[PDB]
């Protein structure tokens, strides 16, 4: 309540920080078929692999891990919305404090106007009396 | 030290004053109005069994 300035400053700082740490959603994988069984056996044949071997597809594992990571990214989006609403409330409060400060400033300004016009009158009358003494 | 004076009074004295007093944080003891009636008198009288 001393300097809404510095407080909102730290607030927007936290903002920048988190805001900018970008996070990229999980990537997409080859349309299921790939590498296409028909072609896999060809690869497993032009390799001259000693031990006889089979082609164990894993597409499913990759796909469900992607499900989990996308779920996590949606949770991240929710957290983001929540933090945004929090920063909005913080701004509301700091803005009330700032309207207070702006009123204070306008008031000090009008007071300065008053004192200045008053001293103007005073110095005018002082010149008057000094010249009048010079005459007397 | 003026900025430290600002932060001092905002951290030793920034919270609301906890000396709340109207009539109700006080217990029910502070709502009574004592009165005291009676009459003393000296008499030269017997005891009247």
């Amino acid at each position: 309540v001393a300097n809404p300035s510095d407080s909102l400053m730290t607030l927007a700082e936290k903002c920048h920080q988190k805001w900018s740490q970008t996070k990229n959603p999980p990537a997409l994988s080859p349309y299921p078929p790939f590498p296409a069984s028909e072609e896999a056996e060809a690869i497993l044949q032009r390799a001259n692999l000693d031990y006889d071997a089979v082609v164990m597809d894993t597409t499913g594992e990759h796909l469900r891990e992607t499900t989990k990571t996308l779920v996590q990214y949606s949770q991240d989006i929710l957290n983001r919305d929540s933090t945004i609403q929090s920063v909005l409330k913080s701004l509301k409060a700091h803005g009330h404090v700032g309207n207070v400060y702006d009123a204070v400033e306008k008031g000090n300004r009008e007071r300065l106007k008053q004192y200045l016009d008053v001293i103007a009158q005073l110095q005018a009358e002082m010149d008057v009396t000094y010249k009048s003494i010079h005459y007397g | 030290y003026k900025h430290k004076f600002d932060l001092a009074a905002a951290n030793i004295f920034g919270g609301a004053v906890r000396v709340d007093v109207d009539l109700d944080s006080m217990p029910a003891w502070m709502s009574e109005k004592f009165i005291l009636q009676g009459s003393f008198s000296v008499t030269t009288a017997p005891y009247a069994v």
């Binding site: 607030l11 805001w19 299921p32 949606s74 989006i77 945004i84 701004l91 700032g98 300004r109 300065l112 | -």
Partner: protein, 160 residues
């Protein structure tokens, strides 16, 4: 006027906070969870299904149709992953833009506050200067000079 200024932030934020994409993403995530669930369900069910049989021969056609259905199911799984990914990326874009609006307003309001406070400092300093001025120089001067002019009236009157 920061109170009907941050009220416009609160207004603009939630009305550029499009509800449709978010309900859509909720529904699609629910659907994909239900899908993995029925997937494990089919696993156990086909387990018990082979458990019986063992003498009811599986015809060639059956096995061909089974390979085909398996490729089609991996394909549908990729499809749903893609849909969820797209919706989530769109939601990320909208959220990032809302965050940009918010940070802009914050910094702009921060700067406005700095300006108000600095004007306070300057005007308050000038006040100090002028008040000191009068209470010393100006005031002394005025009083002593009025005393002198009164003495002058006195002498001129004693004269006439």
């Amino acid at each position: 006027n920061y109170e009907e200024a941050t009220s416009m932030l609160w207004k603009v934020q939630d009305m550029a906070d499009e509800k449709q994409l978010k309900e859509e993403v909720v529904k699609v995530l629910e659907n994909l969870v239900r899908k993995q669930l029925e997937r494990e369900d089919a696993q156990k069910r086909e387990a018990e299904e082979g458990g019986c049989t063992y003498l009811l021969e599986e015809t060639s056609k059956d096995r061909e149709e089974k390979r085909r259905r398996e490729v089609e199911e991996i394909r549908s799984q990729w499809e749903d992953i893609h849909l969820l990914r797209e919706l989530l990326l769109r939601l990320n874009k909208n959220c990032t833009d809302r965050e940009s609006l918010v940070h802009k307003f914050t910094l702009s309001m921060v700067g406005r506050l700095q300006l108000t406070e600095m004007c306070n400092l300057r005007i308050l300093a000038e006040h100090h200067n002028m008040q000191r001025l009068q209470q010393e120089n100006l005031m002394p001067l005025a009083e002593v000079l009025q005393a002198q002019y009164i003495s002058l009236f006195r002498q001129m009157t004693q004269e006439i």
